[PDB]
Amino acid sequence: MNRPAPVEISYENMRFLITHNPTNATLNKFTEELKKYGVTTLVRVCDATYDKAPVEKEGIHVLDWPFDDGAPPPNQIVDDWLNLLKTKFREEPGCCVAVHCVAGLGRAPVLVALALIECGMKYEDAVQFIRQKRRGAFNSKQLLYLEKYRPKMRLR
Amino acid sequence: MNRPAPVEISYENMRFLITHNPTNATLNKFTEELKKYGVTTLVRVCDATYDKAPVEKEGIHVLDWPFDDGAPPPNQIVDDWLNLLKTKFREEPGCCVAVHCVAGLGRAPVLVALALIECGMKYEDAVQFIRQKRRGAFNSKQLLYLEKYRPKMRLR
Amino acid sequence: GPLNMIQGVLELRCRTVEDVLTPLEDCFMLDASTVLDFGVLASIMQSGHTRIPVYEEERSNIVDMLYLKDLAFVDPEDCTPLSTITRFYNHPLHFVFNDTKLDAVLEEFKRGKSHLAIVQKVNNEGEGDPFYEVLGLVTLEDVIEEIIR
Amino acid sequence: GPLNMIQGVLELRCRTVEDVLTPLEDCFMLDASTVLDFGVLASIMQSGHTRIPVYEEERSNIVDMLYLKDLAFVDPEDCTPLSTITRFYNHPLHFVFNDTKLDAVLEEFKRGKSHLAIVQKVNNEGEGDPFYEVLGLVTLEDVIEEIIR
């Protein structure tokens, strides 16, 4: 059985880390986990009350991209995201992008799923691989969105 | 399962109570147990450091008749005892004689056993009835003595 | 008796934590913000639990476990808050899915330090994202009770 | 696993307290004359026993049981002696014969408050009268361990 702990996802050069939220206290310990898993880039996508810089003063690129609880990612957000991944994995391959949010199994995993699909993983496999590592995965809408999604397919 | 608690034996007008030892503190509580079971007469037969009167000020006839650890009762002691029982049960029938000693299963039970035998209970039955209520009963010598014992048979 | 217990062990593989659990409202639990005064300590010892969930600021948000051992040199007055204590030890906290079969939980419990997991089911109703809903607690006892009846 | 446990329940009727007991020297126990200072209390809580035998003035002379609950408003310094506490509650103490079959002890334990009996055998060697020799303690755990292995 498990704690309230991070969850890493890989393939191919891509490595993600879906996480919990810190309060400002935990925040030194939180940034320690991050550095361990080799993350360069955190993407907030729910709101969090911790005040980031300490994570930035440690040189992790933080991104505040909140979207609606339960929703699929807005169009931009998805564009930014894919575009973000290209540059960040180009910067140093096999590093980690962290995504974090209060639940852990709603919208954060979607970005990740999106990534794998747009990177050639069967939609079905994508959902299963995510649900393997965190169970509960997504909601109907999250899943609708995921099936209906069509890779360009765009990820150099 | 059991505590370190008294053990009552009856038949016919005869009622005995084999007990533990009190320190002088317990002694008010100890005398309370005694009065409950309707005892008139305590027979110490191991030594005890409690100082009796409080038991006598409550009107229980105390008798100090110690004999050797492991031994059968000296001849007198047995004579006194049988003789004691006649008078005490004559005084008020169906009362209780208490016998007490540190073990609980050595010499005190012998007096009781003696009583039942000299009162017409098969030696075998006597030992079994006692061992029923307190297990461990007697030792070889205690048992030797008991079989070899021959009721007059003397108990009005 | 021996035959019931035999049925019980055999039924482990069929019944689940949900059957055996202890709902939240019925568990001894502590508010993180509590202060360890004589009364609450007494409360603790009188609980006859040796491992007590600590929540904030509502019972389903379980943030920490308080072990009895943790109380060792705390002096009532000084009037120490419960969170200073919890913050001395990262005691881990075990979550189990409501679905899990008892035979499995038995094994987990043997294979760990723990004699109590917090129970969770995923929850799909609502617009929001799925979440884990805390149902309450299962203990090693709870599972033994299954067997010795 | 499930089959071992089945063997275990079935073997209850054959094995006895002696097989499963905890010898005296290996039990957490307390001297009646002890004083409940911060250290000993801590010692208590760190024992992770909730029911502790109290002896005087050598471990086989067991005079009382100390329940954790009993510690509820005792303040270290005041430096209360252990016997003043024991003398607040006549908690009963259960003795079991070394001979007794586990299946029986299981039942006793269910049919009482107790999760721990003190083990005794009658002792015939010696000139003296028979006596009961304390061997140590059996707990409800000890019996469960029989089953869940």
Numbering used by the authors:
A (entry chain A), B (entry chain A): 1 to 156
C (entry chain C), D (entry chain C): 298 to 446
Sentences from the paper on this structure:
Recent reports have shown PRL phosphatases bind tightly to the CNNM family of membrane proteins to regulate magnesium efflux. We report four new crystal structures of PRL proteins bound to the CNNM3 CBS-pair domain that reveal the effects of cysteine disulphide formation and nucleotide binding on complex formation.
We also crystallized PRL2 with CNNM3 under a variety of conditions in order to assess variability in the complexes. PRL phosphatases are highly prone to oxidation through formation of an intramolecular disulfide bond, Cys101-Cys46 in PRL2, or Cys104-Cys49 in PRL34. We compared the structure of PRL2 with a disulfide to our previously reported structure with reduced PRL25. Oxidation did not induce any large scale conformational changes: the reduced and oxidized phosphatases overlay within 0.6 Å. The largest changes were adjacent to the cysteine residues that form the disulfide bond. Disulfide bond formation moves the cysteine away from the CNNM loop and flips alanine 103 so that its methyl group points toward the CNNM3 aspartic acid residue. This shifts the CNNM3 loop by 1 Å, which may contribute to the lower affinity of CNNM3 for oxidized PRL2. Crystal structures of PRL3 (C104A), and the oxidized forms of PRL2 and PRL1 all show a deep pocket which is closed off in the complex with reduced PRL2.
